[PDB]
Structures are given as C-alpha cells and as structure tokens.
Amino acid sequence: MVPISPIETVPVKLKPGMDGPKVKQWPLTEEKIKALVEICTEMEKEGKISKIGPENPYNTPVFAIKKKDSTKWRKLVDFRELNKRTQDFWEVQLGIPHPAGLKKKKSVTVLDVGDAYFSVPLDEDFRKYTAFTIPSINNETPGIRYQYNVLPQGWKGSPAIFQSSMTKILEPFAAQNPDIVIIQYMDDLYVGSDLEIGQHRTKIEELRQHLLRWGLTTPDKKHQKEPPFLWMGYELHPDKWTVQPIVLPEKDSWTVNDIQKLVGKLNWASQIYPGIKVRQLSKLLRGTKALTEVIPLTEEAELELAENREILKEPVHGVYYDPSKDLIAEIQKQGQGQWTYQIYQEPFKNLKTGKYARMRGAHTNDVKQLTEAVQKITTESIVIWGKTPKFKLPIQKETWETWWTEYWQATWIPEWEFVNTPPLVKLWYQLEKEPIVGAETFYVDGAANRETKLGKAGYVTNKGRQKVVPLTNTTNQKTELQAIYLALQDSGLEVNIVTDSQYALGIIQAQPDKSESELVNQIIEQLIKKEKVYLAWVPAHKGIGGNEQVDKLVSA
Amino acid sequence: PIETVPVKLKPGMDGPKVKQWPLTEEKIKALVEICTEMEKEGKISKIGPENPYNTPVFAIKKKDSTKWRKLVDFRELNKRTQDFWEVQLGIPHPAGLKKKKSVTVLDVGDAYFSVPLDEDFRKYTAFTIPSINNETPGIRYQYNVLPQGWKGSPAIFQSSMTKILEPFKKQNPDIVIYQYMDDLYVGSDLEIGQHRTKIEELRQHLLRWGFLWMGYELHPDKWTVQPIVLPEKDSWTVNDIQKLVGKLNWASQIYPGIKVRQLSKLLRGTKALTEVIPLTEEAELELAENREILKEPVHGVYYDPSKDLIAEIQKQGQGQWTYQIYQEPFKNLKTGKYARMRGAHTNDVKQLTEAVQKITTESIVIWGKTPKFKLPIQKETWETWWTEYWQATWIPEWEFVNTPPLVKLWYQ
Ligand SMILES: Cc1cc(/C=C/C#N)cc(C)c1Oc1nc(NC2CCN(Cc3ccc(S(N)(=O)=O)cc3)CC2)nc2ccsc12
Ligand SMILES: [Mg+2]
C-alpha cells in the first residue's frame, strides 16, 4: 500500500438558526426499492455512503428513475430542502474565459477527473444532514438509512468544494510548471502547452504522478473529441475560434419568444460577427409578458433581420491573443442609438467584435454615446486582456477637444486616434458664451393653465417684433419650449434669446442632438440652421423688462 | 499583543459580498507580490469556499512614490461593522487642528499589522486577487491582523497608539496630533523650518516603538466660506444687469435683505442685450447695500455631527474647480476653489479625482469625517477611471449629477 495524502476537508455549516431537513420519504414500488437497495449497496462498498442508526432525525427523499433504452434504474436523492438550509459558498466558477483572451496552444490533453471527485470527503459534522431512507419491502421492516461520506451530486456545496479541492491539489504543479496551462471543466481537466509533443506528453505523465499523491487516477477522456472542442457555446480550433453555428430560423409568424431567442442568438453571434443589430427586434418586446403573442415585424425589423442574415451567411472566425502585439478597438456608429466595435491586433483579423446600445433617456447626443461605448469596451478589455486597447474613433480630434473643454461634466476617453469612416460623430451646434452685437434680442415666455391645459407661447424683441400663439392641450414646460422654438423660427442667422425657463435651460445646456420630445427635436433642427445663438436666463417675476412684457402676454 | 479585541457586525447584518472589479495585468502582478509577502509574514492567509464574503481590492501609488500599494475598499464592511465607542464614548474632534499653520499627514497604517484580528471576525475581511480573463480562480485571502482601511483598526489600536505618542505629546504640548483611519495629522504652529524636524523626530520616535518616510503638509489658515462677490463696473450692458439680478436672486436664498427691485427697473422696456444701461443712484445704492450684506457671514450656520456632510463640485473650465461643503442647502460650512491640478492638464477625470481627495482631506481636518460627494460626471466614466488616479488610503462616498446645475455661473 502506497500512502496517499488526504484531501483537506472543507468545514460546512447550515444557515444560522436553521436546522437540517426533515422530509418524509415517499412510498415506492417493490421493483424500485429492490433497485435502490442494489445501487446503494455498491455505493456503500465504495465508501460513498454509510449505514446509520435510528438516532439521526434528518431525512431527504430518494427516488428511482429510468431512461428510454438504458434498461436500468437510476438513484436520485432530492437535496432541494437541504440546499435551502445550507450556507452560501464562494462559487469560484462564476465567469468563464473568453476565447479572444486565450493564447495559442500547440498541444492540449484532456484528462478525466470524474472519479477523483469521490476522493473529496464531506465534512464529518455535516454528514448527518444528508440522511436518506430506502423504504423496506411491504413496510414490514425498518427502512435502510444511509448518509453521505462524499460530496453528494445535487447538493449545494458540491461544485464549489470539488473545484476548490482540485485547484489546491494542482496549485504546486502549475506553479512549478510555468510553461503549461491547466483548467477544470466539469469532470474534465484540460492541459495545454507550447512544448513539442515529446516534452508535453512527459508533463502529462508528471501530472498523473503528482495526482497519485492523493490517490487520484486520471485516464484520458474516453472517445477523444477531435478539434474543435465544443465548450461553453464556442468552437475552439487550434488557431481560430468562433461561436457554434448560428442558424436564423425561417418563419412567417413570430411571437415574442421566437424573437427573444433570436435576440439571444444575435447577441451571442455579435461577439464575432461584426455589424449585428438587434434594436428594432428588441423594441418589439418591451411591454409584454405573454410569450405566445404573435407580433408583426415592422418593415424596419424585417430590414434589420435581413441584414443580419447577410452577415450570418458565411462563418467568420476570431484570432487568439498575441501579447507581443498591440490591442486595438475600432467603433462605428450604426444609427438609432446603436454602435458596433471590433477588437484586433493586425488589420482584418478580429479577436472579437461587439455592439453597444444607447441608454434610455429623454435626450442624448452622439458624443455621449460614443463615450459610453468607449468605457464599456475599456472595461471588457481589462477583463479579457488586462489592458486598455488603443481606440480608433470616428470623431475628429478637434471635435473631441471642443466637446470636453466646453462640456459642464468631467469626461475622458483614453488614448485614441481619429479614423475617417463615415458617419462621423460631430457637434451639431454650439451656443455663444457672450451676447451677440447687432443680433436681434428675443424675450420669450410661455404659460399654460393647469386645469384647462390652455396655454400661450411667444416673444417680443428690441425691434418691436412680437408674436403670441394660442395653444391647446399643453403644459407650462411645453409652452416654455414652444416660445424658444418660435424665436428661433422667426429670427435671422444670429439671435440673442432671453428666457426664464430653468427647465428649458437644463435641457439645452445638456447639449442634446436628439430627443424623445418632438418639440426639443424641432428646436435642435433650428439650432443647427443658425450661425450664432446666445441663450440667456433671467429669473421670472422680478420686473425684468422684455421678460415681464412677454410674461403678461402669455399668462392669459 | 496576543489578546485580540472581540468585534461584531451590526445586528441582523451579514458580511460584505461586494464584487471585485477588473484589474489591469500590472496591478494584479503587483498585488500578487504584495500579498505573497504578507502571507509569508502571517498578515493574511488563504481561505476556502466556505467563505462567501468579498471586499474589493486594487493597487495605487501614493503621492510622489513608485512602489505599488495595496488598497482595500472596505466601504461596505465599514458601514456593516459595529459602532465603536473605543475606550471612551468618543474623542471630541480637535477643533484646533484646522487652526495650525502647518499640518503634516503621516501614513501609520503599517502599525496595524502588529495587532491580531479577532479570529471570529477574520472571515469578513475576505478579498480576491482576480486573474486575467478568468483563466485561473481568483486568489482568496482573509486578514489575520488589523487591516489598513478598516473602521475598527484605529479604534482597536488606539490604546496602543495613545501610549506611543504621550512621551512626544508632553514634550510638545502645543502640537496637535489627530488620527483618522490609517493617517496621523500632526499640526504645529511653528514655521516649516523646524516643523519637518519635529515630524522627523516623531517619525523616529515611532520606529523606536516598533514610518514610510513620507508626509504631505497642509496649511489650514485658509479654510473659510468664500464670499459672494459682485462685479464692479463703470458701464453695464443689459446682459450684465440680467446676470447680476440672477446672481442676486440666487444669493437672496442665502442672505436676508438682498433686493433687486431698483436694478430690475433699469431694465424697463425691451432692450438689446448689448446696450449700455446707466445705473441710477437708487440702483447704485441698492447694489451697494447688497455688497454690504454679502460682506457678513451667513445667519445661523452650525455643524451638526449627526448629519452627513455634503460636498458639491463644479467644473469651471481651464483646470478650475469650485466646491461647497454643507449639511443643509444654502448653509455652506466651507466653500473653495481650485486651479492647476498637477499632472493632468488634459484629463478632466484625473483633475476631479484629485479635487475629491483634497476636499476630503480638508473635511477630515475640520470635522474628522468625510463628506458625501455630488460629482459632475456620468457614473460609467467615473467608475471606469477614478481608481487610476486615487492616491489616498481612505475612500469617501459619492453620487452623480446628471442635470447641469444653473448655479455653476454664481460660483464662477
Ligand atoms: C486548455 C483549455 C482547453 C479548453 C477546452 C475545453 C473543451 N472542450 C478550454 C480552455 C479554456 C482551456 O484553457 C486555456 N486555453 C488556452 N488556449 C486555448 C487552448 C485550446 N486552443 C484550441 C486547440 C488547441 C490545440 C489542439 S490540438 N492540436 O492539440 O489538437 C486543439 C484545439 C485554443 C487556445 N489558454 C489558456 C491560458 C490559461 S488557461 C487556458
Ligand atoms: Mg412667465
């Protein structure tokens, strides 16, 4: 007998105050009981479970299940109640590697560690909570009662404790073999390296020698998968990676969940297929929870889905990461708040792709959206590669300089250069900092009656130009914007405008180029037509001329 | 110091479960080396999957330094840790620190590593060194000793600190020494010349009692509420008068007796914005009376140590930033203005991050606590970048301003 080290046991507790499960065993057929007795008998001789006396007051129901052609019975212990009462664990399997961050590996071996799983002992003081009972034939004897000595499959802590125990086991081997990489994927262990096949195979044999120290035997996975590996929805080829095939289904009738798995396939495909768009398909969902509701595709969603078929016509592949070369991210404006990007090191061979959609808001502009896209790509790139990429953006250096030096908020984009790929992001208007000499001065105001929704909007100017327009079904805020719109409409290319509307200032000072309010959009279109606009604010009802005169005109 | 002080969380509160944010490769490598040697020195230990808690960690470089420093963001654990009435029901904040001519700040956080942490509480200090691209599981640690940046560390260590100082303290009984978290604020009313020696003899005083060579020095003779000033002009345009009346209308929320009636009547009619308006002497008198009102302090402004301090910041352009500290609107306890933020003439966010740290430092000196910031920046931009320019060992709270305040013009 060769002495083997024990696997260090993880201490486990129930949630504070809670006790172990006490669930009654359901009645079974005689044939199922006979099946469960044989299964547990062999499990017992393998050390997985152990018979217990009648003092244990806990119980978890056990079942017997079959399969179609598999003509045997399966054991199943339903630990749902115990899982509700078990402490939380550090789930160390949260995020997976992204293939675009992986580096080429000449050779990769697959090891089966499924039987090493049962060498992981369960905390002695917790075993009592895993008790279960095989009912007896005809209920004429006491049921056979067992408890687990190993990590039960289906128990809350089993995946985290298993992977943590293997990682601790493998830690010295990985650290003293820096020229190999090891990761664990369910019952599979994958070992890659750039060594010639001779030295690689040696490292594998050394790994088996290392795992024997804990009594773990690791044969290579049966029925060797020849490349590519089907892993986490990807195809990992020796020099390329891509998602598994994306197949858009043909349909003349789509309901809201046919589109929601369409959105998921496209969202999945968008990490390598460039230019994928999903807004017009996603907008077709918002306010419904009944998934069988057939919704007609808009003409804009058929167009969008058609364009996605054209990008999905041919498989495309991403390259793996070369740390010796630069990391570059390039962004394009797509329209309707949508943006796409490619991350690459050499031209025309993308590591990955992606998309960004503008946040929900009343008003927005392209520069703010481009900035948000940059921050998202920055954060994703630090996750995948540990560094910020160099950016190529469709915005002139002079445009960005004007924006951030005048914007009321602090803002920042990391190292980037202009790429001349239309449509270019630009500033569509810029208000003046000082009043314009020789330009007509419009004093604007609007008012609406809260109960009747009747209102007025208008202006008076230093040249005696005047206007008041009556309005129905309106609010104070809308009439204040209307008044500004009228002044812009009726003035020459340069104009000074005086308002008391804090609401209108707050909108315009946010520098929107698009809005969900058609009135704001109309104001934006007027601002684009002007050469110079100075917008000045004054407090209301303080006797300021021009403003006091127009306030009288519009306040009934 | 073998006896650990028992520590608990607030009633009905679990430990922190804060996600670790992504780190660059060079910050990960720095944290690996730092934590490897901390583990060798017994300050931290590896932990298992039965610990589900987490507090974020990153790496910084302190002022004028190139050695990486580990910074733990204990903000969540701090608000979940029991209130600490140390050995007293409290230390009254030294109201004289903000009056000294010179205050040097000394990083004494390394002293915390001499005191072991309550073994039942260690699990709540769990943190994770992440790996790039999730290619290995994060390195999980917990603290065995008082960690830098934790609320309990200065409280539990203070009795040990009171005695380390008091030989120095009775030598120089007019030197005010104040402790906030990992930092010691040593203020002397003597000119810089022998202040540095007095800090250096404290610096060697401590090392004889079991450092970091480093100290940033402040001069709080400055710290007041900046006055509201009005323009002094010989010719006023309609636009000038309009801006003045708007500023005075805003000031009238703060000061009693501000009047704009006579100044408004100068704007009787519908005049071009650029037209010059001669001031009547009624308007001049009214303007003069407002000037006088704005010379006096604001009525009934008092610090209430039970309420939060609020700090607002405005970007004024050209590297200039204005800020106000208050607890109640229009009752400013302190206002200020900054210019020429070092090492960032082309980085708004770096400038804002440095402004936040300097305002927080001022707030520590004056009140002994950090303010809650209202930051003029989008959340996603701030969150992506502020750790890149952070140089302090504490971290305040902040919220984001998404609508442009009209009042930026009035602090202009
Ligand atoms: C090593 C490994 C394997 C898999 C597969 C699971 C399945 N099912 C998944 C991950 C995340 C792995 O983990 C790492 N993988 C890499 N790189 C990869 C390795 C695989 N190749 C593909 C390939 C290579 C060689 C052959 S071959 N010629 O041997 O047949 C066939 C296919 C692409 C890059 N890098 C790292 C770094 C730290 S972990 C880790
Ligand atoms: Mg009005």
Structural domain boundaries of chain B? 6-95+121-161, 96-120+162-217, 218-303, 304-412
Q: Whose CA is nearest to atom 27 of ligand 1?
A: A107
CB-based contacts of B206, cutoff 8 Å, min separation 6:
B108, B111, B164
Beta-bridged to residue B326, according to DSSP, are: B310, B332
Taking CA atoms, what residue in A is nearest to B262?
A543
Pick the CATH number of B218-303 from 3.40.50.150, 1.10.1740.10, 3.30.70.270, 2.60.200.20: 3.30.70.270
Domains of chain A: 1-92+118-158 (3.10.10.10), 93-117+159-227 (3.30.70.270), 228-321 (3.30.70.270), 322-428 (3.30.70.270), 429-556 (3.30.420.10)
Q: Least CB-CB distance to A410: which of B22, B269, B352?
A: B352
Type of residue numbered B255? Y
Q: How far is B287 from chain A (nearest CA, A)?
A: 15
State how far the Cα of A345 lies from the Cα of A414, in Å rounded to an integer: 18
Type of residue numbered A546? G
State how far the Cα of A234 lies from the Cα of A241, in Å rounded to an integer: 7
Binding site residue list of A: 112, 187-188, 445, 480, 500, 551
Taking CA atoms, what residue in B is nearest to A498?
B273
Type of residue numbered A18? M
- Assess contact for A314 and A404: CB atoms under 8 A: no
The token duo for A519 is 């009135």
3-class state of residue A553 by DSSP: helix
CB-based contacts of A476, cutoff 8 Å, min separation 6:
A446, A447, A448, A450, A455
* Cβ neighbours of A134 (radius 10 Å): 23
Hunting for tokens 């609107």 — which residue is that?
A: B329
Taking CA atoms, what residue in B is nearest to A538?
B246
- Assess contact for A473 and A528: CB atoms under 8 A: no
State how far the Cα of B235 lies from the Cα of B248, in Å rounded to an integer: 18
Method: X-ray
- Two domains, one topology: B96-120+162-217 and B218-303: yes
Peptide bond into B297 cis (omega under 30): no
Phi/psi of residue B385, nearest 5 degrees: -120, -20
Question: Exposed/middle/buried for A529, CB within 10 Å: 0-12, 13-18, 19+?
Answer: exposed
List of chain A residues whose C-beta atoms are within 8 Å of the C-beta of residue B270: 441, 443, 460-462, 464, 545-546, 549
Peptide bond into A394 cis (omega under 30): no
The token duo for A59 is 């119980």
The answer to whether A88 contacts B52, with C-beta atoms less than 8 Å apart, is yes
Encode B214-270 in three state secondary structure: CCEEECHHHCCCCCCCCCCCCCEEHHHHHHHHHHHHHHCCCCCCCCCHHHHHHCCCC
List of chain B residues whose C-beta atoms are within 8 Å of the C-beta of residue A157: 49-50
- Assess contact for B28 and B129: CB atoms under 8 A: yes
Q: With CA atoms as reference, report the closest residue to B280 among B320, B315, B236, B323.
A: B236
Residue B240 annotated as lining a ligand binding site: no
- Assess contact for A128 and A148: CB atoms under 8 A: no
Q: How far is B355 from chain A (nearest CA, A)?
A: 12
Task: Pick the atom of ligand 1 nearest to A104's CA.
Answer: 34
Q: Least CB-CB distance to A545: which of B24, B25, B268?
A: B268
Q: How far is B384 from chain A (nearest CA, A)?
A: 7
- The CA A446 to ligand 2 mean position distance, Å, reads 6
* Cβ neighbours of A544 (radius 10 Å): 27
CB-based contacts of A431, cutoff 8 Å, min separation 6:
A508, A533, A534, A535
Q: Which of B:80-139 have CB within 8 Å of A?
A: 132-138
State how far the Cα of B206 lies from the Cα of A429, in Å rounded to an integer: 61
Largest CA distance in chain A: 109
Q: With CA atoms as reference, report the closest residue to B353 among B365, B343, B363.
A: B343
Q: How far is B174 from chain A (nearest CA, A)?
A: 42
> Using CA atoms in the order A223, A228, A233, A239, what is the torsion angle rounded to 10 degrees?
150
List of chain B residues whose C-beta atoms are within 8 Å of the C-beta of residue A496: 272-273
3-class state of residue B167 by DSSP: helix
- Assess contact for B318 and B324: CB atoms under 8 A: no
Handedness of CA A300, A301, A305, A308 (dihedral sign): positive
3-class state of residue B334 by DSSP: strand
Sheet bearing A241-243, strands edge to edge: A229-231, A234-236, A241-243
Beta-bridged to residue B75, according to DSSP, are: none
Q: Which of A:169-228 have CB within 8 Å of B?
A: 174, 181, 183
Q: Least CB-CB distance to B134: which of A96, A371, A411?
A: A96
- Assess contact for A375 and B384: CB atoms under 8 A: yes
The token duo for A9 is 């046991």
CB-based contacts of B292, cutoff 8 Å, min separation 6:
none
The answer to whether A496 contacts B273, with C-beta atoms less than 8 Å apart, is yes
A–B CB contacts, 8 A cutoff, strictly below:
188
Q: How many CA atoms lie within 13 A of B261 on its CB side?
A: 5
Would you say domain B96-120+162-217 falls under CATH 3.20.190.10? no
The token duo for B325 is 């500290």
How big is chain B, counted in residues? 412
Handedness of CA B289, B294, B295, B299 (dihedral sign): positive
| Best residue in A411, A443, A532 for a mutation probing chain B (most B CBs within 10 Å) | A411
State how far the Cα of B292 lies from the Cα of B248, in Å rounded to an integer: 13
Type of residue numbered B399? E
**Long-range contact set of residues A47-52: C-beta below 8 Å, sequence gap at least 24:** A47/A118, A47/A149, A47/A150, A48/A118, A48/A148, A48/A149, A48/A150, A49/A146, A49/A147, A49/A148, A49/A149, A49/A150, A50/A146, A50/A147, A50/A149, A51/A144, A51/A145, A51/A146, A52/A128, A52/A131, A52/A145, A52/A146, A52/A147
State how far the Cα of A393 lies from the Cα of A405, in Å rounded to an integer: 18
Report the topology of domain B304-412.
Alpha-Beta Plaits (3.30.70)
Cα distances from A274 to residues A320, A418, B62, B93, B266, in angstroms, run 17, 20, 42, 60, 63
> Using CA atoms in the order A542, A547, A550, A554, what is the torsion angle rounded to 10 degrees?
-60
Residue B319 contacts A, CB cutoff 8 Å: no
Q: Quick one: resolution in A?
A: 2.0
CB-based contacts of A109, cutoff 8 Å, min separation 6:
A190, A191, A192, A200, A201, A204, A220
CB-based contacts of B174, cutoff 8 Å, min separation 6:
B188, B189
How big is chain A, counted in residues? 556
Superfamily of domain B6-95+121-161: HIV Type 1 Reverse Transcriptase, subunit A, domain 1 (3.10.10.10)
**Long-range contact set of residues B79-85: C-beta below 8 Å, sequence gap at least 24:** B80/B9, B80/B10, B80/B13, B80/B14, B80/B15, B80/B16, B80/B124, B81/B7, B81/B9, B81/B10, B81/B150, B81/B151, B81/B152, B82/B7, B82/B8, B82/B9, B82/B10, B83/B10, B84/B151, B84/B152, B84/B155
Beta-bridged to residue B317, according to DSSP, are: B320
